[model samples]
Target chain A: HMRVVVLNWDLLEQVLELGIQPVGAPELSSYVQWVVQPEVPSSVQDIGTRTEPNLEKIAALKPDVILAAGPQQDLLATLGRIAPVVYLPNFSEQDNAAQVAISHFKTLATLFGKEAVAQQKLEAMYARFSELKASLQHAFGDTLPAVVTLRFANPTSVFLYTENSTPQYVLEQLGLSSALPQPPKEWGIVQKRLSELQHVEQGYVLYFLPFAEEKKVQKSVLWRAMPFVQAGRVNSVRPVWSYGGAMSLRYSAEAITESLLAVAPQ
Target chain B: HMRVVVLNWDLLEQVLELGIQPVGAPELSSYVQWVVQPEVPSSVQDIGTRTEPNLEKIAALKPDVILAAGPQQDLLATLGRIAPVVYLPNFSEQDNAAQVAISHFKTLATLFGKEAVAQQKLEAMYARFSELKASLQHAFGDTLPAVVTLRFANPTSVFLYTENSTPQYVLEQLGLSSALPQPPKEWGIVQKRLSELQHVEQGYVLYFLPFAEEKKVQKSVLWRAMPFVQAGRVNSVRPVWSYGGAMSLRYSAEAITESLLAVAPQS
Candidate 1:
């Protein structure tokens, strides 16, 4: 078994999903709190933060391979000196992050000789998406509500998940369309004023939770006046990692469907 | 004349300040609008944005040497094929960004064979810092107000300049200390809520301008009640590029000194 050290969370997710336990991964506490899926066991050593992994700890781990990502592109030389570094660049403005993540999953599968496991998992995810889509259709009838997914940056602003984002991909998989479509950018999110939510005229609004100021926003006159709020179509999705790999898409779909169903018109 | 193509604004500033006209630079309009120092001339061709430079246009210019920085590091091999790439890394959590910028400035000077110009400019910049420090001392009587510098991210959040940042470097050069000190980080700014400004209870606050919600912030009862605001110690400095090289420190120093003087205690 290759002792793998992963520098990014997405790769770590993929490796764990493929039934391989990484010897090391960065920010385990944050991963458990944020990612919350494909659980990183306590056996995994804490490498450090993704942006700045502890080279010393990583060297001591004596990993057979180190999986890196876009943020670690500059550190390749130094990381390579310690072990063979595999850089998988994601979230580029020019590329589709969701599609790139899927490709990365397949690449990792091939690397670890887990092609059979990868195929089975991917198929299961698609089946789960179909199951979730049927459940939403049943809850909302034939015509689904156009949904806008976002996370509150503050009471004044929000970061809307745009095209090429995993959340948008998840939305489409459930036969939903964006009430407010924004052009894709790196990281696939656009930050705009909370007033911009006015554009979601007749659509549902789903915000990801763990927002510190949710109570403050709920009390705001401005938020109460939003069309979606008045229509009883606004809800908060349970915390799920939006930037995770293939299985994360399924997680998002399941979370979104549950949130949407809760706010569905009777 | 080396037909230079600069990928980042900081390097572009160093090149322009060294009296060398680059053949091409990315986001010329942005450079003119944001950096606004050692001005990028009209003859320089617009390549593209710093993040996504137009490679074809850069290839068309067929520059002698390409000056690049941290953001452009990933494109080094591809950029090398177009021309010899000079990758000058800066703004690391490991090194002081301001000092790294100075080192980069000297590196560029050596590259362009303008070592003498670089030396003279650096000395002049230090002299300018001294002159600014004296003016600040005269206004505040040798006991400058401890100041915290920030840019408003929104009415509720701010990006505070911390240790190793160019703004912090500029503050120290003016014989001032930060009213609110945050640990050093990459980019040298920390995002915190607006209520955090309460910690600067006895010190002055300087926020960089172009805040769209300034009128709204002014009208807010919450803002007016802050100790710094109530004590008449808060002011906004005019726009200066915080991430620019050696000379930008001077621009920041001048703008900061002017803002502090306006809010300085008078007899």
Candidate 2:
């Protein structure tokens, strides 16, 4: 029953961190492109893309369980022929992010009777968390840093991550405050015009900027005048799926913090 | 020619981090208790405390250069009488401890003409600093944390740190806000009663307590009822001399950050 198959990248990392390699996972290229750690081993077969998983390939492996997120649940009947479908929730209250992740870890542990490994990884993650907190305290002191994280879709627009996002949970756990405004984004993000930064000039501005897009924004007068920009507190991070699981969440924290170093306060 | 003598714990750490072995320093026991990295080697002779170094014995070593803090300038005439005394300032502008430390590092490097080694250490320190900043970003986002750091001298009193302290500089560099209110204390601290925490009900509270003194505060009625105490914002740290050099600044940052882990804000 522990022989698992996953329908998306997020759960793929979750199961991998729990010490279980899925029999098959979707879109290996995207997983490599997106998430950096708890890598999907080559041993796991690629069933196909997430939206269009190769049923025939998955059916051949005869997985004991198929983990699917909310969006993929519609395809349960189609996937059920290969294995029992287990619905997994990816996003929830920011305060419950760790609680949610721990549940996912324990669920897999319970399924495979590998709670020991699950517990060990969790302890290690918490220990690492403690170390991050230590290093952070040294750097920032009592007032934890405030940051706004987002993904840029174009030179004029971006998706600002709200407090409900999984990344915010990492911030909360580490004692940081998310500068993203309230009334949490329904899909965990708010579409914004670049000029809207004036309304939200609270903490450092962190955004994802692929090389081409980054070059374009650098030329925009509007972008340069942003308060955080003038204040010299802008940071850029690599592209990460805002909607990923445990491993992705951890990487988000690392990526966000690493980027902040370049513009460390004067 | 690296044979040197340092009069303060902080400078001792800076010298050691720079790969210079001091011929003599003071208060080995306090240094052992305070600094936990780039440890003091056994070859360094204990000259006495910072204030009262064994001048007679230091004269015996016939050192190349003797390092002393700004506060210890008066002793220069007596110490320079033994060898050339180098006056090193520990706390300058509280906003630039890293900058100050870097300057001090290069100063030592220049005196010994070890510019290459100094450049290497400064680069390495900046890299480590970047890592610390990164971890801090994840812990905090745009809403930078606010903190009030203080030192408990007795069950009833403590000295609150002002922006003038080295810990404040680390906080500033990391993009954190110091919640400690101030007219900027001249000595960079304000001695206050425990009941005075009411006026400064801000962010987390970090107080120092040796293991021996901790149990005494645990049972105090006033200690338990403070807002930060009940809201679970208080943290305790070991005594690392706050007015020490670059290595000491790094340690203060580490110690302060490590102490905050217990009170990590709720998600």
Candidate 3:
């Protein structure tokens, strides 16, 4: 495991998933508390957040790997000055996040010489992917699929699932198309702070997270106007990782398929 | 089409979707640019934005439908006074969105006697609900799928998802399971900003929202070295709407499915 200092907690979570040891990240606040829950364990030392990382503390800890992971061009070089600052290139263009991850994992594995473990684990994971895919394919022969739901930020702003992750890929692999528009990368989503407003009837209304608090925010919006709400098509809200892992190779196939089965209409 | 006046241009897209003629909406720093981009006719008017909506101008236009949508409490109660105000209570629960929409549409239909047409259109549009469910059921026999992603806000804050709108109903219908431990409901999904960071390895991770438009902040700090990152569990990354969607139904569903497909996973 590598001793790492991070400015963000999500990064820490990412690290934790990889079973890496993290050294630094920012502090917690009410706003932070509202968006995420439960503070990181005190065992992981704090090095400061964004602009204010405790370099003194980082220096004290002598972390092997130092990360400057945001899209800010200037910080990457600065962080490079700290340790082997690995700049995760712009992923905006590539929605294939899983591949980026596999690539990253391979790089990290090579750096740490853990490729054997990583590859073996990935192969085991792929098996589950095939199972889910096979089952989905067997179920639907030639019909495209659709996903609809309320957004956590604003219910008035309902979301339509794009060709983004697990469910979309599952359908795609099964020869199904998404019912919604495959708009250009930039069209993004459409939202309505106000309820039932038609000006943005079809923005990115299907996108959502897997948390009750997020949904509360959505419900706080125009809870009654979204089409998903009317059709009773509102499905479960999930964390980004579940579907994100679904991006490729059945990365978390068993977990995702299991979750998908529980999520799909019974 | 019905005549409508909106207090803020932030919701301009929503009003247009209702098939109404938008008379006016506030334009803060020309926030109405999105509206103009679609090349809506000049007849579509512009009012001020936020606290600057032009009431005098609103009164002059005399719109049949006045959109009084609020993210906060209706402190000013700025809508409905001049004309029939359509108060779209915002940020309560996304689960209620379509129901509220039906109520609004029904009322609007009454004003124009277009109820039958509207209902027919609604039914015709999303023709895949039942089939989609069956397909999902055929694939997975459970309704307990779990979704995970890395969430970060500010510097110190990180978050995890609780059972809510974005994933709850959808996962339930799809028979998905959650790897997350139940958190107190009061905290909901805004857990990223909360003081606590919940389960790490057990659940999924929601990584990279690209929220920091000013400079893309989360990439370097925690994104690179976290265990999820190290172990290769960093599933997806997308714009600021994983737990977001300020959109309508079909549009909402479409966006979500699209995001899921692409959020940094391989094909």
Candidate 4:
């Protein structure tokens, strides 16, 4: 009954969050790659990305459920031949993105038979977020702490997140401000220059890159030589999906906020 | 050397997130109510809300680093006579909210000598966030699930968050969708009936409140009747502010998100 084949980790995270049992992933590499928590299915097999999932491995798992989405919808027929296929559309457009997410949640929740528990859980979290935001408003009184999140597009360009991005929104909700004056990239994201780096102020700087390399930049002679860095205002976090999928994204957000707000040097 | 006054616990959460020590608070009741973590700073005294922070108490704290704002700016002069004071403005208006926030953050980072660390930290979080967003976007494309946060308002108003809200921003950033039909109180916020929540096709819901209430409504059954709830779309949470101004507000956000994401419904 637990047999399941998920095309990606985002969906995997959501399935696991619902406490659904996944029998196995088709890729051996996935067994090694899924390291967030509660462990990935030990029975994972190496199926390639959605374009071509491992048929041989999937055939072996004989999953009761096959979760796929976006471009992977093509495999609907193929997976349907083996097991039930549940498709989730991307919440890309602003018009109905939120509605789409909830619908998928409901579809999956009903599939898992967890409506009551899920509702209660959601209510609790919302209430929690509200109080935190309210308390922040009361205390900070519009002194919104600046929040900045960064990523590299390539060796040539670095990108900073903007208002529409997940971290940016979460920070805004908590009365935290986005720190980047402008996106490091032209379309509202980019890499930093020496002078640009000096200008980051009051809010937090989020790095969604590998810690080892990011650390070098933060600790580099040039970085340390900067005002923000030397002043002890700048901070770095290990890579976490701030734009986490339906599954456990908020937790990742909370973890980052708590570490930055309380656990870190603040 | 590490003395500070937080207008409320929420502000404390922000400061603590960046690793600063706060020396003043307004009340002990809320912190007492939630009972989350770190015993509300016992040594830290209450000054009421920033609008009403105890002048005498602030003086008593002998804060080496003091921050005051708009209405409290005059008090800065009073407190400045005793310690260094940094005046920060409010950020309610949407314009430059981030900039104003950063200014405040820098002010504190400078006061506590953590600006360098703050900068390094921002870089790190953003990098991780981007990596996660990119991978998720690549995998899901335009087919990611919808998400939303439903905030609690007075007498039966459900504040649905919009793209302008925190959850919406996160949802958008992650390439996920929200069931949120409206914003919490802004463009990303929505307020509606419990019945309306059931209509959401698929997504997450987060609640936001502008004020505190001793009264708890008996609408448990109503939410369960919702589509997301009935369909098992809703996630988990932690009641913030119930444990008032002495604790880290940021932790409340972290705690709730952690609980929701980690929740494993009964098998």
Candidate 5:
């Protein structure tokens, strides 16, 4: 039995989706809110936050593999003392996210002897992806509709899923155009508001309904009269976790398609 | 060149998706806006609106097949005089939308010798359906989240997609639960105000984002103060055509899953 510890929700999701649940992760409750299903079952214990996993707690667990990613690679030497630090550098520019994600899934599948399941899942995801692309092309024709994906962070600011973000990748796969042009910020988000999108001529606004601020958005007059809203083109594909892995990508695509078809000129 | 004439937007979409350009269809301008894709070629002539197809003009075209749906069956006698009237009855039992749609596609494929293309498309759609179903199950946990699909019409009323509706089948395929317990009055839709949804104990609300009426929804304290709004459970899956075919089903499922995942507990 290989005991594994995950450093972030993305890797944790990749592991669980591959049919392997790790023994620990950071901020289990907060993470659960974002990751939703394929839950961490009560069996998996938390090792505190990802930035600073409780050393004593991880030491006691004696994990066989510390499933880590991103900046967590810095902890490799320190955590190697307790277990083999299999650093999953999931974010790579050379290889697109879909490729990187599948590679990681395959690696985990091999470790857990679940290669067959991984292959089956990957094939299924690609099949779904191809179908979505073809259907969207048919829905919108030669010229794809421009879209901007994001979530309202506060009453005044929204986190834009601009070019280079996972949402952008998903949008490209679905054949929809992105209103947010290339060269996105470091986090791929532009913290702005509905009024800012006014300059976006003829593009659908897909926003993740800000949790706990649903009422505040309604009260903000600027939000109601946003250009897209006035044109009957503004749409809501709320709840898609644009930051998560493959599952999140699929989730975001599905939300975008549904939002588009609901008002697709009909 | 077997020129065809379609009577409604749904069949027009089906024909276009199958890679065939129709010779004519009713309500060209209105239907074109609703579809706005597959690029209805300008060469295709407009016979007239569905409510009043120009029998004289359609007869002159001598179309090989007059593709029609719904009450067009009543016009069979008159249209049969001009050409072979192939009536495509797309709507079926509320729960059988997917099956019926594929059957229609299959029939169309057989007519045009596009069996291979039809099979490929069906398999692809099913693949997406299974993938979405699995992921939704994976995302929500042991119990699937309840959802109500609808669109706001005006300040006082909105249409809810119910059990026999196309959205219901999409939700069923995803293995997600539905929150609408009330009976549908017309066209598998229940028209009511936002205040009524307060009785819904727990479930997500999927609405076609009210365009011009965004302010109306916000101003109606009853709409803004609903339990789902307070819980941040009310979300929009706008622009999906629930009455359309398999393409719409796939699109609706995509929109629904995306919206739901965006807000669901991410832990």
Candidate 6:
């Protein structure tokens, strides 16, 4: 097995999903906390934080090839000194994140000589997506409710998922449209006031969980006044990692499908 | 004068201040509205937005050198085909923005062969800083109020200036300290809720204008309940461009001093 050092969590997830344990990766604890899928084996060495990785530890790993992404794009020159650096930049304002992640999965599959495994995993993901979409349609009947996915930043603000985001892509995969369409941004998430949720007039709004201020927001006169809240169309989805590889798309679709089904017309 | 094409507003300001008119710069009109200092010459052509500049126009201008900052770092390889690219990255989590801007000013002056010009301008800026500091000291009678400078993102949130920000640097130059200190960040700003301003329990708070929701925020029960608001220790400073080169320090210091003097104790 060729030893690979991964600099980004998304790439690490792809590598793990392909059944290869990388020699090193950054912030293993945080990966467990945030990414939470395709578990990182105990054998992998911690390279430090993604933004500021421990270069000396990475070199000591003596990997054949190092995987890098957008945050590490500027560090290619420095990382190149240690091993052959494979640069796969994603999540740009120009590139659609889900599409890019799928492409990168194929690219990595080629690099690791695991095309069959990659193909199988992608097929499994698509099959799961189709299954999730069918379930959503079954719950909603002919017409599904338009949806907006978001994460509450605080009680008063949110990072709303827009076009080009993984969550939006998942919504489309599940046969749903955005309740509130916003222009594409670099991360596909736009910061908007909680008051802005009023625009989700006749659609369901699903916010990701682990927002500490949920109770406070729920008690607010403002949160209760939203169209979705009045119609009982708002719900909280499980914590699905927004910025991950192909498998993450399935995770998001599952979580979204589950949440939408919870609020589906009885 | 060397024909330079600047890709960042801070670099554009530095080039303009150094007695050289850039052949091309990004978002000329927005620069006028936001930066609002060292008036841009009409002769300069608009390249495009800072994030996405028109490479064709840049190549057509045949700039002697292209001056770029952090945003344009990835585009350097593409820009090099047109002209020599000088990458001057700033506002990193590691480096102080003010110190980096000062160093970048010197670098630009050397490239344009304006070391003497740079020297004189720096001296003048320091002298102006001294004058501003003295005036502030006189107004406060040696015990200046600790201050926090921020820009209102909305009626309910603010982009608070933290350590390593230009405003914090200017506050220091004016002999003041942060009322509520925050850790350094890449852009030296932390997005915080408006209610978080309650932490400015004793020191003054200054928000940069033109916030349209000022009237609405003022009318809020929460805004009225803030300690700083109750103590008459909060005021709005005129719009001074927070991110700029060396001379912007003087501009910010002057603006902050004036705002602080307005709220100073009348003996």
DockQ of each: 0.01, 0.01, 0.01, 0.02, 0.02, 0.01
Q: Choose 2 or 4, whichever is better by DockQ.
A: 4
Each candidate's TM vs. the true structure? Answer: 0.50, 0.48, 0.39, 0.43, 0.48, 0.50
Show model 1 residue runs off by greater than 4 Å.
A1-266
Query: Chain B vs. true chain B: TM-score for each candidate?
Result: 0.96, 0.88, 0.63, 0.67, 0.86, 0.96
TM-score of chain A of each: 0.96, 0.89, 0.65, 0.73, 0.87, 0.94
User: Which residue pairs come into collision in candidate 6?
Assistant: none
Which candidate wins on lDDT? 1
On TM-score, who's better, 1 or 4?
Answer: 1
Docking class of 4: incorrect
lDDT tens string, model 4, A127-205? 6566666655554564646666666553323566654455555565465766675532222344555456556765555
Off by over 4 Å in 5: A91-96, A137-142, B1-267
Mark the 10 consecutive residues where model 2 chain A has the least summed lDDT: A90-99
- Model 3 misplaced regions, further than 4 Å: A8-14, A26-42, A50-54, A135-144, A148-151, A158-176, A184-207, A210-222, A242-266, B1-267
Better of 2 and 6 by TM-score: 6
With candidate 2 superimposed using the best TM-score fit, by how many Å does residue B129's alpha carbon deviate from the native? 3.9
Each prediction's interface RMSD?
Answer: 21.5, 16.3, 16.5, 12.0, 12.6, 22.5
Give per-residue CA lDDT, model 5, range A94-201, as digits (tens): 333556665777887888898898888777777777787787777778687988888788777878875667778888888788886655554456677657876776
Model 1 Cα lDDT, one tens digit per residue, B1-267: 789999988888888888999999988876666677778889999999888999999999999999988888889999999999999877777767887888788888988898769866776676677688788889888567799999889998899998979999888767787899989887889999998888788779999876789988877877888999999999998878888887887789999999998978883
Candidate 5 lDDT by residue in tens digits, B175-259: 6777875453334577777667887668688776425677768667887788787788877665565666556667777778888
The per-residue C-alpha lDDT of model 1 at residue B26 equals 86
Worst 10 residues of 4 chain B by lDDT: B242-251
Fnat, model by model in order, equals 0.00, 0.00, 0.00, 0.00, 0.00, 0.00
User: For candidate 6, what TM-score does chain B get against the true chain B?
Assistant: 0.96
